[PDB]
Design an enzyme around this catalytic site. Structure first.
Site, PDB file in Angstrom:
ATOM      1  N   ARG A 142       0.862  -1.171   0.000  1.00  0.00           N
ATOM      2  CA  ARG A 142       0.000   0.000   0.000  1.00  0.00           C
ATOM      3  C   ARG A 142       0.901   1.224   0.000  1.00  0.00           C
ATOM      4  NH1 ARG A 142      -3.509   0.019   5.035  1.00  0.00           N
ATOM      5  NH2 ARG A 142      -4.520  -1.747   3.992  1.00  0.00           N
ATOM      6  N   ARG A 195      -1.769   6.425   9.311  1.00  0.00           N
ATOM      7  CA  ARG A 195      -2.151   5.895   7.997  1.00  0.00           C
ATOM      8  C   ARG A 195      -2.384   7.016   6.970  1.00  0.00           C
ATOM      9  NH1 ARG A 195      -3.415   0.619   8.147  1.00  0.00           N
ATOM     10  NH2 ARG A 195      -2.130  -0.374   9.762  1.00  0.00           N
ATOM     11  N   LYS A 212      -3.022   2.073  15.171  1.00  0.00           N
ATOM     12  CA  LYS A 212      -2.939   2.890  13.967  1.00  0.00           C
ATOM     13  C   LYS A 212      -3.762   4.167  14.194  1.00  0.00           C
ATOM     14  CE  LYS A 212      -5.063  -0.398  11.748  1.00  0.00           C
ATOM     15  NZ  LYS A 212      -5.682  -1.262  10.702  1.00  0.00           N
ATOM     16  N   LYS A 266      -5.668   7.462  12.252  1.00  0.00           N
ATOM     17  CA  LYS A 266      -6.216   7.879  10.959  1.00  0.00           C
ATOM     18  C   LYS A 266      -6.653   9.338  10.959  1.00  0.00           C
ATOM     19  CE  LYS A 266      -7.419   3.264   9.446  1.00  0.00           C
ATOM     20  NZ  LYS A 266      -8.451   2.216   9.297  1.00  0.00           N
ATOM     21  N   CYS A 286     -15.246  -4.092   1.271  1.00  0.00           N
ATOM     22  CA  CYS A 286     -13.815  -4.197   1.510  1.00  0.00           C
ATOM     23  C   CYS A 286     -13.290  -5.326   0.608  1.00  0.00           C
ATOM     24  CB  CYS A 286     -13.514  -4.519   2.979  1.00  0.00           C
ATOM     25  SG  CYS A 286     -14.008  -6.203   3.473  1.00  0.00           S
ATOM     26  N   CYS A 323      -7.459 -11.215   1.971  1.00  0.00           N
ATOM     27  CA  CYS A 323      -7.466 -10.883   3.388  1.00  0.00           C
ATOM     28  C   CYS A 323      -7.423 -12.095   4.300  1.00  0.00           C
ATOM     29  CB  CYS A 323      -8.637  -9.982   3.751  1.00  0.00           C
ATOM     30  SG  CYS A 323      -8.484  -9.405   5.469  1.00  0.00           S
ATOM     31  N   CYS A 338     -15.460  -8.637   7.672  1.00  0.00           N
ATOM     32  CA  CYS A 338     -15.314  -9.061   9.061  1.00  0.00           C
ATOM     33  C   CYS A 338     -15.544  -7.792   9.884  1.00  0.00           C
ATOM     34  CB  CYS A 338     -13.936  -9.695   9.324  1.00  0.00           C
ATOM     35  SG  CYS A 338     -12.530  -8.552   9.496  1.00  0.00           S
ATOM     36  N   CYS A 344     -13.319  -2.461   7.625  1.00  0.00           N
ATOM     37  CA  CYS A 344     -12.698  -1.754   6.521  1.00  0.00           C
ATOM     38  C   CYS A 344     -13.682  -1.241   5.465  1.00  0.00           C
ATOM     39  CB  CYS A 344     -11.666  -2.666   5.869  1.00  0.00           C
ATOM     40  SG  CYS A 344     -10.518  -3.416   7.073  1.00  0.00           S
TER      41      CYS A 344
HETATM   42  C1  SRM Z   1      -8.024  -1.889   1.485  1.00  0.00           C
HETATM   43  C2  SRM Z   1      -8.873  -1.560   2.755  1.00  0.00           C
HETATM   44  C3  SRM Z   1     -10.447  -1.849   2.417  1.00  0.00           C
HETATM   45  C4  SRM Z   1     -10.911  -1.466   1.035  1.00  0.00           C
HETATM   46  O1  SRM Z   1     -11.508  -2.305   0.357  1.00  0.00           O
HETATM   47  O2  SRM Z   1     -10.679  -0.321   0.613  1.00  0.00           O
HETATM   48  C5  SRM Z   1      -8.478  -2.389   3.951  1.00  0.00           C
HETATM   49  C6  SRM Z   1      -7.948  -3.648   4.005  1.00  0.00           C
HETATM   50  C7  SRM Z   1      -7.433  -4.270   5.126  1.00  0.00           C
HETATM   51  N1  SRM Z   1      -7.464  -3.827   6.422  1.00  0.00           N
HETATM   52 FE1  SRM Z   1      -8.467  -2.128   7.004  1.00  0.00          FE
HETATM   53  N2  SRM Z   1      -8.673  -1.553   5.061  1.00  0.00           N
HETATM   54  C8  SRM Z   1      -9.054  -0.280   4.640  1.00  0.00           C
HETATM   55  C9  SRM Z   1      -9.690   0.656   5.431  1.00  0.00           C
HETATM   56  C10 SRM Z   1      -9.986   0.482   6.781  1.00  0.00           C
HETATM   57  C11 SRM Z   1     -11.093   1.160   7.488  1.00  0.00           C
HETATM   58  C12 SRM Z   1     -11.811   2.285   6.785  1.00  0.00           C
HETATM   59  C13 SRM Z   1     -11.070   3.600   6.759  1.00  0.00           C
HETATM   60  O3  SRM Z   1      -9.962   3.692   7.320  1.00  0.00           O
HETATM   61  O4  SRM Z   1     -11.592   4.555   6.165  1.00  0.00           O
HETATM   62  C14 SRM Z   1     -11.225   0.674   8.760  1.00  0.00           C
HETATM   63  C15 SRM Z   1     -12.323   1.157   9.707  1.00  0.00           C
HETATM   64  C16 SRM Z   1     -12.050   2.409  10.520  1.00  0.00           C
HETATM   65  C17 SRM Z   1     -11.144   2.130  11.683  1.00  0.00           C
HETATM   66  O5  SRM Z   1      -9.929   2.010  11.472  1.00  0.00           O
HETATM   67  O6  SRM Z   1     -11.638   2.016  12.818  1.00  0.00           O
HETATM   68  C18 SRM Z   1     -10.263  -0.455   8.810  1.00  0.00           C
HETATM   69  C19 SRM Z   1      -9.959  -1.299   9.857  1.00  0.00           C
HETATM   70  C20 SRM Z   1      -9.080  -2.335   9.951  1.00  0.00           C
HETATM   71  C21 SRM Z   1      -8.771  -3.092  11.147  1.00  0.00           C
HETATM   72  C22 SRM Z   1      -9.382  -2.978  12.534  1.00  0.00           C
HETATM   73  C23 SRM Z   1      -8.596  -1.859  13.191  1.00  0.00           C
HETATM   74  C24 SRM Z   1      -8.965  -1.636  14.642  1.00  0.00           C
HETATM   75  O7  SRM Z   1      -8.859  -0.486  15.108  1.00  0.00           O
HETATM   76  O8  SRM Z   1      -9.347  -2.603  15.324  1.00  0.00           O
HETATM   77  C25 SRM Z   1      -7.854  -4.025  10.755  1.00  0.00           C
HETATM   78  C26 SRM Z   1      -7.225  -5.111  11.534  1.00  0.00           C
HETATM   79  C27 SRM Z   1      -6.150  -4.692  12.518  1.00  0.00           C
HETATM   80  O9  SRM Z   1      -5.547  -3.615  12.353  1.00  0.00           O
HETATM   81  O10 SRM Z   1      -5.905  -5.450  13.473  1.00  0.00           O
HETATM   82  C28 SRM Z   1      -7.601  -3.924   9.364  1.00  0.00           C
HETATM   83  C29 SRM Z   1      -6.805  -4.773   8.603  1.00  0.00           C
HETATM   84  C30 SRM Z   1      -6.701  -4.714   7.204  1.00  0.00           C
HETATM   85  C31 SRM Z   1      -5.864  -5.632   6.303  1.00  0.00           C
HETATM   86  C32 SRM Z   1      -4.517  -4.899   6.015  1.00  0.00           C
HETATM   87  C33 SRM Z   1      -5.843  -7.043   6.814  1.00  0.00           C
HETATM   88  C34 SRM Z   1      -4.677  -7.468   7.679  1.00  0.00           C
HETATM   89  O11 SRM Z   1      -4.551  -6.978   8.818  1.00  0.00           O
HETATM   90  O12 SRM Z   1      -3.879  -8.302   7.227  1.00  0.00           O
HETATM   91  C35 SRM Z   1      -6.796  -5.640   5.172  1.00  0.00           C
HETATM   92  C36 SRM Z   1      -6.093  -5.983   3.899  1.00  0.00           C
HETATM   93  C37 SRM Z   1      -7.002  -6.746   2.962  1.00  0.00           C
HETATM   94  C38 SRM Z   1      -6.364  -6.984   1.605  1.00  0.00           C
HETATM   95  O13 SRM Z   1      -6.047  -8.146   1.301  1.00  0.00           O
HETATM   96  O14 SRM Z   1      -6.186  -6.014   0.836  1.00  0.00           O
HETATM   97  N3  SRM Z   1      -8.334  -2.854   8.893  1.00  0.00           N
HETATM   98  N4  SRM Z   1      -9.679  -0.555   7.579  1.00  0.00           N
HETATM   99  C39 SRM Z   1      -8.594  -0.119   3.232  1.00  0.00           C
HETATM  100  C40 SRM Z   1      -7.183   0.255   3.114  1.00  0.00           C
HETATM  101  C41 SRM Z   1      -7.107   1.680   3.622  1.00  0.00           C
HETATM  102  C42 SRM Z   1      -5.761   2.321   3.339  1.00  0.00           C
HETATM  103  O15 SRM Z   1      -5.367   2.366   2.164  1.00  0.00           O
HETATM  104  O16 SRM Z   1      -5.096   2.771   4.291  1.00  0.00           O
HETATM  105  S1  SF4 Z   2     -13.024  -5.785   7.057  1.00  0.00           S
HETATM  106 FE1  SF4 Z   2     -12.051  -7.720   7.583  1.00  0.00          FE
HETATM  107  S2  SF4 Z   2     -12.226  -8.957   5.637  1.00  0.00           S
HETATM  108 FE2  SF4 Z   2     -12.510  -6.836   5.061  1.00  0.00          FE
HETATM  109  S3  SF4 Z   2     -10.510  -6.199   4.322  1.00  0.00           S
HETATM  110 FE3  SF4 Z   2     -10.819  -5.571   6.544  1.00  0.00          FE
HETATM  111  S4  SF4 Z   2      -9.803  -7.121   7.769  1.00  0.00           S
HETATM  112 FE4  SF4 Z   2     -10.219  -8.031   5.690  1.00  0.00          FE
HETATM  113  O1  LIG Z   3      -5.127  -1.594   7.787  1.00  0.00           O
HETATM  114  S1  LIG Z   3      -6.583  -1.027   7.367  1.00  0.00           S
HETATM  115  O2  LIG Z   3      -6.740   0.064   8.159  1.00  0.00           O
HETATM  116  O3  LIG Z   3      -6.365  -0.530   6.158  1.00  0.00           O
END
Ligand code: SRM
Ligand code: SF4
Ligand SMILES: O=S([O-])[O-]
Ligand code: NA
Length: 472
Positions: free
Chosen positions: A3, A73, A117, A119, A336, A342, A381, A385
């Site tokens: 990314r 981020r 993280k 944001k 997502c 993922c 999940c 995201c």
């Molecule tokens: C690509 C994306 C979704 C999408 O379809 O666009 C995504 C994809 C992933 N997120 Fe996210 N997140 C994405 C926006 C977000 C959002 C929305 C936002 O930020 O606008 C959230 C919700 C808001 C928040 O953060 O509270 C989000 C909350 C998470 C979390 C839970 C974080 C937490 O505070 O508990 C995780 C898991 C973790 O960090 O443990 C996570 C984990 C991940 C990972 C990197 C999985 C991992 O830990 O191995 C996912 C990768 C999937 C893949 O194979 O590509 N992602 N994730 C976004 C990438 C954003 C970026 O470029 O920086």
């Molecule tokens: S919401 Fe869950 S399944 Fe979807 S990209 Fe984020 S970590 Fe993966």
């Molecule tokens: O790691 S998620 O926030 O993109």
């Protein structure tokens, strides 16, 4: 998975051509995936290509710094403001905040860094396309006479929850106050350091700023920010949002400039049979005068097209299938990545959304509301995201083919949807919505959105203070 760090989603055509090449030659999937945080990802990078990927980014002035760790981020910035001229300075501020919060490798981040993280966003009302409530720190731009004068600071948003864990919750951001433009970095730094110091480091599920704020209190957190920043917050200045969607199609910018926002389903850029989306974009990048802007809705804006170039660009976008007309519903839906990449995925999201929206489109048509839209999101999940926890209708993956159905958010994204049905399948989800959409279509007030309707019509109780009433 790789990314990129891309403040405000602005990427040059030169940089684009470089990512397009690498994605095609050096990844298993061969696609460019636009994310909802205004940047992109590659999927399936061969370990041999791990080195050349950073070199490639670097050669075009890009870097993947702090894009997937306990740091700050990608910083978002409203992509296509109605008052086009405000974008330039808001964007310069998003870039400054991003740079200011970057690790010195740590005066701000600290040796241990951040508990979780962090944001951040820069928002230009009336658009909340960046979904400010999903973020820790938000700077809402206040302008006067076409120039920014300062920002309203909102702190504490975050959407991640854990199934059946009432100690976790999505929470919206709280208003702190207004700050003149000159205090921006001091304030940004102050919020990060306080969270760094006060954040629960022992339990990662409770480390986020939203939890910290709830533990110490907004005013307690606010006072420390003022103490640390060397300022006193002035009262919040008036601001309102009208929507979160992109402006699909052409819109007029400053001078003879035009912006063409292309709807890209799931932000997945690849060449498909008869729809060479990836090649079409490469072709536009080659002749485009200007930049591209990756939106928070996983779409792409071909920005700053001189009026004389409109037809040229439109010809390619059209032939490539990039301008294939979709319903307003499809344009306002998001998912997502989820499977196959993922590792935390419970249910399909990206691969499920297209056919699911095919079904929703039928229901919208059946009820005579095909010109309407419901902000509908599917997250694979509970990490959230897909930003389902700010949707009017949010589906949260629980197991293969099963999701928790949430209802009651609003179009502008200032309210969290309460869980309506739990662990149900698509046919069960469709049956519920068929009925619900039927009611909205016939009982709604003039211009009343689906989310507000479900709340007004007593179909779902609203979430008024997430830390205390999100869970039944
Ligand atoms: C690509 C994306 C979704 C999408 O379809 O666009 C995504 C994809 C992933 N997120 Fe996210 N997140 C994405 C926006 C977000 C959002 C929305 C936002 O930020 O606008 C959230 C919700 C808001 C928040 O953060 O509270 C989000 C909350 C998470 C979390 C839970 C974080 C937490 O505070 O508990 C995780 C898991 C973790 O960090 O443990 C996570 C984990 C991940 C990972 C990197 C999985 C991992 O830990 O191995 C996912 C990768 C999937 C893949 O194979 O590509 N992602 N994730 C976004 C990438 C954003 C970026 O470029 O920086
Ligand atoms: S919401 Fe869950 S399944 Fe979807 S990209 Fe984020 S970590 Fe993966
Ligand atoms: O790691 S998620 O926030 O993109
Ligand atoms: Na999209």
């Amino acid at each position: 998975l790789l990314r990129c760090r891309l403040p405000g989603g602005v990427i040059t055509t030169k940089q684009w051509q470089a990512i397009d090449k690498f994605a095609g030659e050096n990844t298993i999937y061969g696609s460019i995936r636009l994310t909802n945080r205004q940047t992109f990802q590659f999927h399936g990078i061969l370990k041999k290509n791990v080195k050349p990927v950073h070199q490639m980014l670097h050669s075009v002035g890009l870097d993947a710094l702090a894009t997937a760790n306990d740091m700050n981020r990608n910083v978002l910035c409203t992509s296509n403001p109605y008052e086009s001229q405000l974008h330039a300075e808001a964007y310069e501020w998003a870039k400054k905040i991003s740079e200011h919060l970057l690790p010195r490798t740590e005066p701000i981040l600290g040796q241990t860094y951040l508990p979780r993280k962090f944001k951040t966003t820069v928002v230009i009302p009336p658009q909340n396309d960046i979904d400010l409530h999903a973020n820790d720190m938000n700077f809402v731009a206040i302008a006067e006479n076409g120039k920014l004068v300062g920002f309203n600071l909102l702190v504490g948003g975050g959407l991640s929850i854990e199934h059946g864990n009432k100690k976790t919750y999505a929470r919206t951001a709280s208003e702190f106050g207004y700050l003149p433009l000159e205090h921006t970095l001091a304030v940004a730094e102050a919020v990060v350091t306080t969270q760094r110091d006060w954040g629960n480091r022992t339990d990662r599920k409770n480390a986020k700023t939203k939890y910290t704020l709830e533990r110490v209190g907004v005013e307690t957190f606010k006072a420390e920010v003022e103490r640390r920043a060397g300022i006193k917050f002035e009262p919040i200045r008036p601001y309102e949002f009208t929507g979160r969607g992109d402006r699909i199609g052409w819109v007029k910018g400053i001078d003879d400039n035009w912006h063409l926002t292309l709807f890209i389903e799931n932000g997945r850029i690849l060449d498909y049979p008869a729809r060479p989306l990836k090649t079409g974009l490469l072709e536009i990048a080659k002749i485009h005068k200007g930049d591209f802007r990756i939106t928070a809705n996983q779409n792409l804006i071909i920005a700053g097209v001189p009026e004389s170039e409109k037809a040229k660009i439109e010809k390619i976008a059209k032939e490539s299938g990039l301008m294939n007309a979709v319903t307003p519903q499809r344009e306002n839906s998001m998912a997502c990545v989820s499977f196959p990449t993922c590792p935390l995925a419970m249910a399909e999201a990206e691969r499920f959304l297209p056919s699911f929206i095919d079904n929703i489109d039928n229901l919208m048509a059946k009820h005579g509301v095909s010109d309407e839209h419901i902000v509908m999101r599917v997250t694979g999940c509970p990490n959230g995201c897909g930003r389902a926890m700010l949707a009017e209708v949010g589906l949260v993956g629980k197991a293969p083919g099963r999701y928790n159905l949430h209802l009651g958010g609003n179009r502008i994204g200032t309210r969290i949807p309460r869980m309506y049905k739990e662990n149900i399948t698509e046919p069960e989800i469709l049956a519920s919505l068929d009925e619900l959409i039927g009611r909205w279509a016939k009982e709604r007030e003039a211009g009343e959105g689906f989310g507000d309707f479900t709340v007004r019509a007593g179909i779902i109780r609203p979430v008024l203070d997430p830390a205390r009433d999100l869970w039944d």
